[PDB]
Structures are given as structure tokens and as C-alpha cells.
Amino acid sequence: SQVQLQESGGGLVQAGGSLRLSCAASGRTFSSDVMGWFRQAPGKEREFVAAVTRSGGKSYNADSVKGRFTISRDNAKNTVSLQMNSLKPEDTAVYYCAAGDTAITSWYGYDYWGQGTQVTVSS
């Protein structure tokens, strides 16, 4: 059928607080190349956040992450966590999980997307 990227761990938190985003793939099974997170603040462009490859290679939008966030592969099939610390009101955005398929030619490219989950960081 279809690939579904189920996102959780979001919600409301106070500035300086933490969140642990989780993305678990369901539906049609696929061999993942890379899984990561994107986000879109109100009235702004959707931007990259973090990603981990199936080899364990990690990359970050360091200019916005600033070493605060840590992505990692979970034990389960196509499951990824994003540990977000020291959150600020500018981190308030809709966060999208994205997954890359090995069966799709582009290397470390993203093919499947989650519906998005809300993250709101109060002052």
C-alpha cells in the first residue's frame, strides 16, 4: 500500500525545556537510506534540521541546531529519535519526518514525508 511516517514526541514545552521527537515508519515496508527531520516556522521556509543514515552517519543544520539537538537510530525498523534540548520560542514550528528509499536512485534523498507534528515553545 502506502508508506506512513508516524510522528510523536511533540507538543508544548517551556523555553529551556526538552522534547524527544520520534518517527516510526508503518504501512508498506521499504529499505530506508536515511531518516531525518524538517521544520517550518510560521511564515517561513521549510528547513532541514537533522538526519541519520543507515550507516550511522549524522548531519545537522548546525546554524539553527547549534549542537542542541541529537538524532539517533532506534532499535526498530525505520525508527528515528531527535533529542531536542535548550529549546527557544524560535524553535516553534511544524516538524516533518522524512525518509529516504534505497530503491529510489538519489543518494540520501528524501521520498516519504510525515503529516507533520506541532512543536510550541513558550517564553
PDB file of C-alpha atoms in Angstrom:
ATOM      1  CA  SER A   1       0.000   0.000   0.000  1.00  0.00           C
ATOM      2  CA  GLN A   2       1.481   3.313   1.146  1.00  0.00           C
ATOM      3  CA  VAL A   3       4.347   4.364   3.394  1.00  0.00           C
ATOM      4  CA  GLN A   4       3.286   6.138   6.570  1.00  0.00           C
ATOM      5  CA  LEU A   5       5.723   8.088   8.732  1.00  0.00           C
ATOM      6  CA  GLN A   6       4.156   8.412  12.182  1.00  0.00           C
ATOM      7  CA  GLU A   7       5.430  11.350  14.225  1.00  0.00           C
ATOM      8  CA  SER A   8       5.282  11.722  18.010  1.00  0.00           C
ATOM      9  CA  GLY A   9       7.004  13.383  20.965  1.00  0.00           C
ATOM     10  CA  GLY A  10       5.972  16.919  20.053  1.00  0.00           C
ATOM     11  CA  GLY A  11       3.616  19.227  21.926  1.00  0.00           C
ATOM     12  CA  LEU A  12       4.019  22.231  24.206  1.00  0.00           C
ATOM     13  CA  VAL A  13       7.137  22.952  26.270  1.00  0.00           C
ATOM     14  CA  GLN A  14       8.644  25.957  28.058  1.00  0.00           C
ATOM     15  CA  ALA A  15      11.808  27.713  26.852  1.00  0.00           C
ATOM     16  CA  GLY A  16      14.889  25.903  28.108  1.00  0.00           C
ATOM     17  CA  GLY A  17      12.913  22.671  28.176  1.00  0.00           C
ATOM     18  CA  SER A  18      13.372  19.476  26.187  1.00  0.00           C
ATOM     19  CA  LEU A  19      11.498  17.316  23.682  1.00  0.00           C
ATOM     20  CA  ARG A  20      12.208  13.896  22.204  1.00  0.00           C
ATOM     21  CA  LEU A  21      10.678  13.624  18.740  1.00  0.00           C
ATOM     22  CA  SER A  22      10.091  10.128  17.379  1.00  0.00           C
ATOM     23  CA  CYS A  23       9.377   8.920  13.849  1.00  0.00           C
ATOM     24  CA  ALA A  24       8.283   5.350  13.136  1.00  0.00           C
ATOM     25  CA  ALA A  25       7.511   4.059   9.648  1.00  0.00           C
ATOM     26  CA  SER A  26       4.398   1.949   9.087  1.00  0.00           C
ATOM     27  CA  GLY A  27       2.396   0.622   6.140  1.00  0.00           C
ATOM     28  CA  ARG A  28       4.313  -0.576   3.081  1.00  0.00           C
ATOM     29  CA  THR A  29       7.727  -1.803   4.233  1.00  0.00           C
ATOM     30  CA  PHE A  30      10.760  -0.309   2.493  1.00  0.00           C
ATOM     31  CA  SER A  31      14.548  -0.302   2.801  1.00  0.00           C
ATOM     32  CA  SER A  32      15.439   3.109   4.218  1.00  0.00           C
ATOM     33  CA  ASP A  33      18.529   5.034   3.117  1.00  0.00           C
ATOM     34  CA  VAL A  34      18.199   7.944   5.517  1.00  0.00           C
ATOM     35  CA  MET A  35      15.690   9.346   8.013  1.00  0.00           C
ATOM     36  CA  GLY A  36      15.609  12.912   9.296  1.00  0.00           C
ATOM     37  CA  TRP A  37      13.567  15.909  10.385  1.00  0.00           C
ATOM     38  CA  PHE A  38      12.491  19.101   8.650  1.00  0.00           C
ATOM     39  CA  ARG A  39      10.599  22.026  10.176  1.00  0.00           C
ATOM     40  CA  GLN A  40       8.639  25.099   9.112  1.00  0.00           C
ATOM     41  CA  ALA A  41       8.156  28.064  11.435  1.00  0.00           C
ATOM     42  CA  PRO A  42       5.105  30.291  10.780  1.00  0.00           C
ATOM     43  CA  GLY A  43       5.599  32.443   7.685  1.00  0.00           C
ATOM     44  CA  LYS A  44       8.992  30.946   6.871  1.00  0.00           C
ATOM     45  CA  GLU A  45      10.644  28.435   4.546  1.00  0.00           C
ATOM     46  CA  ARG A  46      10.739  24.758   5.430  1.00  0.00           C
ATOM     47  CA  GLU A  47      14.280  23.975   6.563  1.00  0.00           C
ATOM     48  CA  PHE A  48      16.438  20.950   7.306  1.00  0.00           C
ATOM     49  CA  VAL A  49      17.133  20.052  10.936  1.00  0.00           C
ATOM     50  CA  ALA A  50      18.907  16.721  11.383  1.00  0.00           C
ATOM     51  CA  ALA A  51      19.316  13.299   9.778  1.00  0.00           C
ATOM     52  CA  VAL A  52      20.933   9.908  10.308  1.00  0.00           C
ATOM     53  CA  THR A  53      21.888   7.398   7.616  1.00  0.00           C
ATOM     54  CA  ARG A  54      21.570   3.617   7.880  1.00  0.00           C
ATOM     55  CA  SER A  55      25.341   3.525   8.393  1.00  0.00           C
ATOM     56  CA  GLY A  56      25.014   5.817  11.400  1.00  0.00           C
ATOM     57  CA  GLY A  57      26.202   8.962   9.642  1.00  0.00           C
ATOM     58  CA  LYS A  58      24.669  12.062  11.214  1.00  0.00           C
ATOM     59  CA  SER A  59      24.224  15.544   9.740  1.00  0.00           C
ATOM     60  CA  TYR A  60      22.748  18.764  11.135  1.00  0.00           C
ATOM     61  CA  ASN A  61      21.541  22.189  10.102  1.00  0.00           C
ATOM     62  CA  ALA A  62      24.181  23.411  12.544  1.00  0.00           C
ATOM     63  CA  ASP A  63      23.354  27.102  12.027  1.00  0.00           C
ATOM     64  CA  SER A  64      19.929  26.596  13.586  1.00  0.00           C
ATOM     65  CA  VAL A  65      20.545  23.496  15.709  1.00  0.00           C
ATOM     66  CA  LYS A  66      23.664  24.873  17.426  1.00  0.00           C
ATOM     67  CA  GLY A  67      24.583  21.481  18.864  1.00  0.00           C
ATOM     68  CA  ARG A  68      21.374  21.409  20.900  1.00  0.00           C
ATOM     69  CA  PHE A  69      19.716  18.544  19.037  1.00  0.00           C
ATOM     70  CA  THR A  70      20.866  14.931  18.712  1.00  0.00           C
ATOM     71  CA  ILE A  71      19.452  12.497  16.161  1.00  0.00           C
ATOM     72  CA  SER A  72      19.855   8.729  16.537  1.00  0.00           C
ATOM     73  CA  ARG A  73      18.618   5.438  15.111  1.00  0.00           C
ATOM     74  CA  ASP A  74      16.244   3.417  17.256  1.00  0.00           C
ATOM     75  CA  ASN A  75      16.213  -0.370  17.511  1.00  0.00           C
ATOM     76  CA  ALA A  76      13.015  -0.839  15.499  1.00  0.00           C
ATOM     77  CA  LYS A  77      12.732  -0.911  11.701  1.00  0.00           C
ATOM     78  CA  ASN A  78      12.941   2.596  10.214  1.00  0.00           C
ATOM     79  CA  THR A  79      12.582   4.352  13.573  1.00  0.00           C
ATOM     80  CA  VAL A  80      14.439   7.551  14.484  1.00  0.00           C
ATOM     81  CA  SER A  81      14.589   9.830  17.540  1.00  0.00           C
ATOM     82  CA  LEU A  82      15.514  13.513  17.821  1.00  0.00           C
ATOM     83  CA  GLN A  83      16.568  14.686  21.284  1.00  0.00           C
ATOM     84  CA  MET A  84      15.946  18.436  21.394  1.00  0.00           C
ATOM     85  CA  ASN A  85      17.450  20.343  24.338  1.00  0.00           C
ATOM     86  CA  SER A  86      17.581  24.025  25.331  1.00  0.00           C
ATOM     87  CA  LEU A  87      14.504  24.901  23.274  1.00  0.00           C
ATOM     88  CA  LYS A  88      13.603  28.503  22.456  1.00  0.00           C
ATOM     89  CA  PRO A  89      10.481  30.232  21.039  1.00  0.00           C
ATOM     90  CA  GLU A  90      12.154  30.315  17.602  1.00  0.00           C
ATOM     91  CA  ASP A  91      12.116  26.508  17.606  1.00  0.00           C
ATOM     92  CA  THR A  92       8.318  26.703  17.406  1.00  0.00           C
ATOM     93  CA  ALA A  93       7.371  25.049  14.114  1.00  0.00           C
ATOM     94  CA  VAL A  94       5.604  22.174  12.401  1.00  0.00           C
ATOM     95  CA  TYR A  95       8.146  19.343  12.363  1.00  0.00           C
ATOM     96  CA  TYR A  96       8.141  16.917   9.444  1.00  0.00           C
ATOM     97  CA  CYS A  97       9.707  13.467   9.459  1.00  0.00           C
ATOM     98  CA  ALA A  98      11.279  12.429   6.159  1.00  0.00           C
ATOM     99  CA  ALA A  99      12.614   9.083   4.967  1.00  0.00           C
ATOM    100  CA  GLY A 100      14.850   8.078   2.081  1.00  0.00           C
ATOM    101  CA  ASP A 101      14.418   4.964  -0.032  1.00  0.00           C
ATOM    102  CA  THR A 102      17.325   2.849  -1.250  1.00  0.00           C
ATOM    103  CA  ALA A 103      15.058   1.646  -4.060  1.00  0.00           C
ATOM    104  CA  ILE A 104      14.878   5.265  -5.229  1.00  0.00           C
ATOM    105  CA  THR A 105      18.063   6.263  -7.055  1.00  0.00           C
ATOM    106  CA  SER A 106      19.001   9.586  -5.426  1.00  0.00           C
ATOM    107  CA  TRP A 107      21.630   9.080  -2.733  1.00  0.00           C
ATOM    108  CA  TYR A 108      20.408  10.071   0.737  1.00  0.00           C
ATOM    109  CA  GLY A 109      17.407  11.740  -0.884  1.00  0.00           C
ATOM    110  CA  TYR A 110      14.022  12.082   0.792  1.00  0.00           C
ATOM    111  CA  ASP A 111      10.994  10.381  -0.716  1.00  0.00           C
ATOM    112  CA  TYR A 112       8.409   9.916   2.031  1.00  0.00           C
ATOM    113  CA  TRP A 113       7.055  12.545   4.409  1.00  0.00           C
ATOM    114  CA  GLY A 114       5.038  12.588   7.619  1.00  0.00           C
ATOM    115  CA  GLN A 115       1.937  14.737   8.053  1.00  0.00           C
ATOM    116  CA  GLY A 116       3.882  16.898  10.487  1.00  0.00           C
ATOM    117  CA  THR A 117       3.621  17.397  14.233  1.00  0.00           C
ATOM    118  CA  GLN A 118       3.304  20.658  16.153  1.00  0.00           C
ATOM    119  CA  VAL A 119       6.022  21.947  18.473  1.00  0.00           C
ATOM    120  CA  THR A 120       5.293  25.076  20.501  1.00  0.00           C
ATOM    121  CA  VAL A 121       7.905  26.602  22.806  1.00  0.00           C
ATOM    122  CA  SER A 122       6.532  29.257  25.156  1.00  0.00           C
ATOM    123  CA  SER A 123       8.605  32.099  26.595  1.00  0.00           C
TER     124      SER A 123
END
